[PDB]
Chains A and B, each alone.
With several copies, the nearest count.
Chain A
Amino acid sequence: TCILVGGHEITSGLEVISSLRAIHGLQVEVCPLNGCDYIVSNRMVVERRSQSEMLNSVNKNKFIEQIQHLQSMFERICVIVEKDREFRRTKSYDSLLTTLIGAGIRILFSSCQEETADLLKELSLVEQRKNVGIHVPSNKSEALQFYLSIPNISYITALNMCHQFSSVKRMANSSLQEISMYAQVTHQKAEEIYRYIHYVFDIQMLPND
């Protein structure tokens, strides 16, 4: 069972990463993800935030925009609020939690990096049982960057495309249903990708210059 970790997590998550490998026996790869912490399945991303980050009202609007970005690419979003390493609550903190609950963003609480890794593993198990887990094992590097350029798809979706389509042409000539199954995305999401690849470019929709 596989999990992708954002590279930025090495500046604060080293015990999360190494527990996941060592204690839990997941395949753990540290990846250049753009805008997320833990991709746990094809459907589920997990954001890791310290109490302090959640308390700090400077971070509120930026967090909500982060969650909004993640909503366009993932069906299941989890926030793990991890205790700071060696806490007074604010209205803004309670307000954020209630906001998240009202939008069905799941919240978990962790007292250390080891416990964060434990929750990540449990979340990994649930998703595996919904047959949406990450399936991966590379002279297909140009192709990956192309697929990542497709709007509102996650790194794992782009990876699936790279792995599953023998060529880019084969991807671009696929049906909506094929994109759904091979890229492991929802109907709606396969629809967005299909419309994009069939979209009739018009130079006159851009400024003249």
Chain B
Amino acid sequence: PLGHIVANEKWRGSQLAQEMQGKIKLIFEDGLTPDFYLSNRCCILYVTEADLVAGNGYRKRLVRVRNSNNLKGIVVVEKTRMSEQYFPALQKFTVLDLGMVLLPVASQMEASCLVIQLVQEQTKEPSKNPLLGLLLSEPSLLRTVQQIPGVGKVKAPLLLQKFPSIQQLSNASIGELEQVVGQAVAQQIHAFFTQP
């Protein structure tokens, strides 16, 4: 749905549902295993303090979502002082076993402001995400060739004029080198490329 969130009935009038009002619209619905749906293919699995204290009851649902095709789960988990001891074990499971995204929250209040952002990010085009959306090598090659002992600022360009690639430079005889840089620096270059 557009500009909307499909929600599980159980969040009717919760602090989460309350703080999202006006910011974002909630279509409630029954029989849903996941807590929310941001789009058709991205859902949320809210794990509460109660869920995490009890044991590994939360996991059943997480397994279903990951093993569903046509669907991805974002797990949001209540990381309090009470629960923090159980969080490592959950995160290992959620992130490293199942491969799913996990976001801790102190409270439902925080999960409100977080879920608004996830929805703003989904709606955003992938280009305007800076971690989704060619050069002259000449400058780099000067610096690479300057790592050869004997070769500085002045000898680097002279060598790349006669031997125009690193490969050709690497294959150059002492004789060919002597013409450009003289006997000593020729030996240094030759030694560098061939020392086993």
Contacts and interface: CB of A to CB of B under 8 A. Distances in A.
Contacts of A143: 192, 195
Interface stretch (B3-11, B53-61, B91-99): B91-99
A23 to B, nearest CB: 14
A169 B193 contact: yes
Nearest to A61: B130
Given A169-B194, A197-B166, A142 B147 contact: yes
Contacts, number: 142
A150 interface: yes
Interface residues on A, range: 35 or more
Q: Chain B contact residues: over half helix, strand or loop, or mixed? A: helix
A7 B193 CA distance: 30
B34 interface: no
A198 B170 contact: no
B113 interface: yes
B84 A202 contact: no
Q: Chain A contact residues: over half helix, strand or loop, or mixed? A: helix
B171 interface: yes
A166 B193 CA distance: 10
Interface string B47-82: 000000000000000000000000000100001000
Given A98-B118, A99-B121, A167 B193 contact: yes
A181 interface: no
Nearest to A70: B131
A89 B91 CA distance: 20
Interface of A: 64, 67-68, 71, 87, 89, 91, 94-95, 97-103, 105-109, 111, 115, 118, 122-123, 126, 139, 142-143, 145-146, 149-151, 166-169, 172-173, 196-203, 205-206
Interface of B: 74, 79, 84, 87-88, 91-92, 95-96, 101-104, 106, 110, 113-114, 117-118, 120-121, 124, 126, 129-132, 135-144, 147-149, 157, 160-161, 164-167, 169-171, 192-196
* A-B residue pairs, 3 tightest by C-beta: A103-B131, A172-B170, A98-B121
Given A94-B114, A201-B137, A206-B142, 6 more contacts: A64-B130, A101-B101, A103-B129, A142-B192, A151-B135, A206-B138
